[PDB]
Amino acid sequence: EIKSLKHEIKELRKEKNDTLNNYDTLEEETDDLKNRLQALEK
């Protein structure tokens, strides 16, 4: 039953990797809007 628990933990890791991909696209959007902020300020 330990292998099933490890598989469930790997599924949780996959879900968190999906959240990390969401974080990465959020980060690229943040970089784009930071460039926009710097362009509109200067």
Binding site: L33, R36, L37, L40, E41
Partner: peptide, 7 residues
């Protein structure tokens, strides 16, 4: 950004 597009 909105501020920089509000003024």
């Amino acid at each position: 950004l909105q501020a920089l597009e509000k003024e």
